[PDB]
Amino acid sequence: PAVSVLTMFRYAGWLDRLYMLVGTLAAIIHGVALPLMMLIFGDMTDSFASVGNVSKNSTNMSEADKRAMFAKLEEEMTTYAYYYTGIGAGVLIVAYIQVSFWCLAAGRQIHKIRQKFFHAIMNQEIGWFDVHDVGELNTRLTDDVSKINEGIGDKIGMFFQAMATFFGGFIIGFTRGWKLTLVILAISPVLGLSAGIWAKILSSFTDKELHAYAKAGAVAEEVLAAIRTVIAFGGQKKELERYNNNLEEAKRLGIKKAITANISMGAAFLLIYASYALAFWYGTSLVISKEYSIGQVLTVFFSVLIGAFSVGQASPNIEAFANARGAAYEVFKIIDNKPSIDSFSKSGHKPDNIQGNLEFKNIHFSYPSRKEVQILKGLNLKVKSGQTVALVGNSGCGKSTTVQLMQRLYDPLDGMVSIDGQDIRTINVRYLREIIGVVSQEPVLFATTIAENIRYGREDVTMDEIEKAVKEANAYDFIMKLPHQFDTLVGERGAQLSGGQKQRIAIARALVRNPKILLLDQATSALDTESEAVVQAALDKAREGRTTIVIAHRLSTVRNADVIAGFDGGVIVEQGNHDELMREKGIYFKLVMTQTDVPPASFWRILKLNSTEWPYFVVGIFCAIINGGLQPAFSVIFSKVVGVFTNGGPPETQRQNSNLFSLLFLILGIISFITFFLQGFTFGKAGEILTKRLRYMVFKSMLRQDVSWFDDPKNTTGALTTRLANDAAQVKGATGSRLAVIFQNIANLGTGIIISLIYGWQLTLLLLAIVPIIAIAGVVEMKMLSGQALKDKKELEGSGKIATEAIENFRTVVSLTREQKFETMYAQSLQIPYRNAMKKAHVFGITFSFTQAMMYFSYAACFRFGAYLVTQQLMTFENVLLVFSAIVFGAMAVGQVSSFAPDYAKATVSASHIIRIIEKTPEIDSYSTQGLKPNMLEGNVQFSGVVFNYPTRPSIPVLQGLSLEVKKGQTLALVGSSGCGKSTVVQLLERFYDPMAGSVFLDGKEIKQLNVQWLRAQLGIVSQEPILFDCSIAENIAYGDNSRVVSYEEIVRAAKEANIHQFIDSLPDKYNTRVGDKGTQLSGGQKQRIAIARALVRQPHILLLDQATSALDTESEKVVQEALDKAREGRTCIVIAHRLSTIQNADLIVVIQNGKVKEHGTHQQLLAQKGIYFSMVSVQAG
Ligand SMILES: Nc1ncnc2c1ncn2[C@@H]1O[C@H](COP(=O)(O)OP(=O)(O)OP(=O)(O)O)[C@@H](O)[C@H]1O
């Protein structure tokens, strides 16, 4: 959808309504300013044509004909040169006003939008945030606001310019003779038609492509997330073929786009060369009959094509304006939306002497994300002033909902909530929340100082009072131990505070507010019994004589409360003191007892990647020379035409010369269509090969890498799918397409420099001296349009980061009632990109003005100097046109080439990354073929003094002097405090990493000397969260022993021994059932048993079990443990043990602490040791 145009320019002050008006009048002038440059150019050839044939045919006088005609041209061209400079003078003024006033008026409007849009979001309801996706909302603050500034800025001034030329151009064409124009305007619908057809066919082969690679690029994403399972089971080649057998689809489809894109080029490049002749063949016949002059035609043919091409230059300026209307709809809706609970209004009462009488009356309530089911039904309950009320009951009974209604974050439907006899929906929201202290489940700390985070509760508090509150909250002594005490910087940027310390800050914040009512919703939940005790002392302190509602999770909180309400299904089944509810032996009694990147890759290296198809490259080079030569050809055939009618000739030859040269256009026009159809058929396949061949070599080379690579923060599973998907394809704009450019550019400017130099060399050294100037200008505009894009958009990140901090914790700030503070913080940050943008339009006023002025001025500096060369009989007027339209129309050709081809800079660095991902050789070559691979199936495992550090964060040491044997067929349990040391042993026997020092042996043999495939083939990885692949049960299981004959019989025996056979045989589509996200979702317990079943098929001599049972499925757990006892029997086993019961039946236990084996032995010996191991078993008991 979109907005009405006249709405969208609201918030535009009267001065912005003026700037947009004055700037338009500039745009209209600048629009017609080039049609005038074509009209004069016509009247200039008339001045040359009138004398060009006098001095040649009849030799009447030698020096009385020289001065006669030549002092006429010298006086005619004084005016034509004064006329040209007059335009560029007016342009210089006009062009400034155009882009100045429009970017200004847009900027002035944006700054008024940002504040009104953010404030609109801080003014919304809390049920408003429930329905909406907050992620896209935050980007909508800086993307959609960035999408509007396009379609109200300078993009309008260019539109009214193009329309003033469309009508300004078709005006001049018609008044200078109507026959020539209606010829063209009969063909321009054929070209306005020809343009849109291909864009329907290019858009066709686009969306078909994103669904072609979506098959291949889906296998890619699944692997690189599941890389731990792929390497550990050696399926690194099986995944290469799946990714490849779907990779031919997007290739063949890539060719139908590659051909048809260069068809679209040469097809429309033909209809120009066709309609050139049709308009010139017919245009020459109207000067031969002495109806038009040569100056008349050359005006009209150009003055039409400019005005006719003015539509295609205004295509995107509309699309940017319609994108701006559309993005402006989602925003303006929010600004004009007004809430029922207005957090900014000043309406309700502000009652004083609030004792805290609390009353709920017949409350019913439904959330608006799931409104089908009611959450609370007929809920009634009073809290007497200064008493504490604990809410208990099972999950889903609206305990927090109660607290949300007393915050008034939703408005109940039926019933009434009153404070001291007064409807809470009849006082003001800010006074309400000012009297209420919110202790959330999780405390939000803001990325600011501790002083400010506390002062957020009440911005006028003195530093004396801060000290008092921090004391009362029990957070002072820990603050006294921090290095930057009350100035320490907290949040995501700063030092991470513990859970206990964060909550006490939230408590101090609420104390600063000194409210009359306190609300706590799981104040202590996550916190351990040690952290909880300090908070409880500080909570209890803060409550002393305040009316309190606490969502209680800990039994000790509930036992000392003055009154308990028991909730069940929205309904208070029993209310009383602690002893009553215990006496009742209802719901409450049951609860309380049970609980007890800048790589400089070279152009030559990239080119070598496509070297396997050099014959394709030779042809494309060849046609890139012809097509680069057709431009300077046209500069002749245009000149040689006009030469006849401007230098001298008999009207017997004006027919054959004109029609010949007029049909040499269609010689050129055909050769245009052929050389493009062939250029994009050889360089086209050369690219679509190159993508497909590099995605393979990459994805192959990616699975070759070792685990330290995939552990890095930069090589995440997404940034590799991107790198594997578009960066792999973006290379082809730097192999063949770069030769096509430079061979075109050489064959164009090369052969065009040569020709113009011989026909007259004086004019050329001027033009090829000035082309350097105007060529520079198109770059610095592209630079400073972009170099300024960073500056203005970098100063916005602070302005955007402020908003990000406020939306991401909206439920908090609204409870602190600091919606205004963050609004002000946003606005104050926005004052920098405002004042920068008000200088930006001043800048782009100039870069746009002095581009067109140095072009309109330099248009005079050529046809003045070139004219004096005809006075002095040094060059003909034909030879001027043969210089001018051989440099200029040829220099414009490289731009029309370079702007079509892919962004070369963006392609080289996009390619430089590909070469690095290919040329990288790992520390652990999984692909290799050497290694001992004996027939000795003992599996004696031995770690001796292994020392290892994670190379993601090598500053952290884990293991020091770790030495240990596992005897054949024994089970070894790893235990100790939480740490990565225990997990590391599994990764080293896998050989996912090498160790720094020490030695890992397998049956007396160094694992660095055994093939990585045959080390890992006899090792079973049982992951925490086992990865199940989108695939059949046979394939997910076959992932274990790959490249193997496995039939139906061998599958069933293994599934028995994992204990899943009986459950499998009654399910629908039994062994064929699709599992994954598309298929039946398996529980946590079932997935792990699949991982066990996969390990049984492999039948290894060693079993690595790592943190298995990472789920809560109670029955499955005993099923897993049964299946596990089966899987271990008479096998050498290494278990990372977290559960005490697993440890009891193990043959040997190792207690590890800080890299050090403090003790080890059988179960019985470690208990009687009465050491570390003893401590673990004792804590669970009591
Ligand atoms: N963002 C949300 N949008 C809509 N409804 C929600 C949202 N969050 C929670 N709910 C609803 O709140 C209802 C009651 O949950 P409640 O917050 O009372 O749990 P609780 O009592 O706090 O339990 P616990 O303390 O264990 O989380 C649920 O039925 C759930 O649908």
Swiss-Prot record:
Its EC number is 7.6.2.2, 7.6.2.1. This is ATP-dependent translocase ABCB1. GO terms for biological process: cellular hyperosmotic salinity response; cellular response to alkaloid; cellular response to antibiotic; cellular response to borneol; cellular response to dexamethasone stimulus; cellular response to estradiol stimulus; cellular response to external biotic stimulus; cellular response to L-glutamate. One of its GO terms (molecular function) is ceramide floppase activity. GO terms for cellular component: apical plasma membrane; brush border membrane; cytoplasm; intercellular canaliculus; plasma membrane. It is found in: Cell membrane; Apical cell membrane; Cytoplasm. Residues 104-152, 203-260, 319-617, 684-738, 781-840, 902-1182 are cytoplasmic. It catalyses: ATP + H2O + xenobioticSide 1 = ADP + phosphate + xenobioticSide 2; ATP + H2O + phospholipidSide 1 = ADP + phosphate + phospholipidSide 2; a 1,2-diacyl-sn-glycero-3-phosphoethanolamine(in) + ATP + H2O = a 1,2-diacyl-sn-glycero-3-phosphoethanolamine(out) + ADP + phosphate + H(+); a 1,2-diacyl-sn-glycero-3-phosphocholine(out) + ATP + H2O = a 1,2-diacyl-sn-glycero-3-phosphocholine(in) + ADP + phosphate + H(+). PROSITE patterns: ABC_TM1F (PS50929), ABC_TRANSPORTER_1 (PS00211), ABC_TRANSPORTER_2 (PS50893). SMART domains: AAA. Pfam families: ABC_membrane (PF00664), ABC_tran (PF00005). Glycans are attached at residues 53, 57, 60. Translocase activity is inhibited by verapamil and is sensitive to energy depletion. C1orf115 regulates drug efflux through modulation of ABCB1 localization and activity. The chain crosses the membrane at residues 14-36, 83-103, 153-174, 182-202, 261-282, 297-318, 618-638, 663-683, 739-759, 761-780, 841-863, 880-901. ATP 1 binds at residues 393-400. Keywords: ATP-binding, Cell membrane, Cytoplasm, Glycoprotein, Membrane, Nucleotide-binding, Phosphoprotein, Repeat, Translocase, Transmembrane, Transmembrane helix, Transport. It is a multi-pass membrane protein. InterPro entries: AAA+_ATPase (IPR003593), ABC1_TM_dom (IPR011527), ABC1_TM_sf (IPR036640), ABC_transporter-like_ATP-bd (IPR003439), ABC_transporter-like_CS (IPR017871), P-loop_NTPase (IPR027417), Type_1_exporter (IPR039421). Translocates drugs and phospholipids across the membrane. Catalyzes the flop of phospholipids from the cytoplasmic to the exoplasmic leaflet of the apical membrane. Participates mainly to the flop of phosphatidylcholine, phosphatidylethanolamine, beta-D-glucosylceramides and sphingomyelins. Energy-dependent efflux pump responsible for decreased drug accumulation in multidrug-resistant cells. Residues 358-594, 941-1179 form the ABC transporter domain.
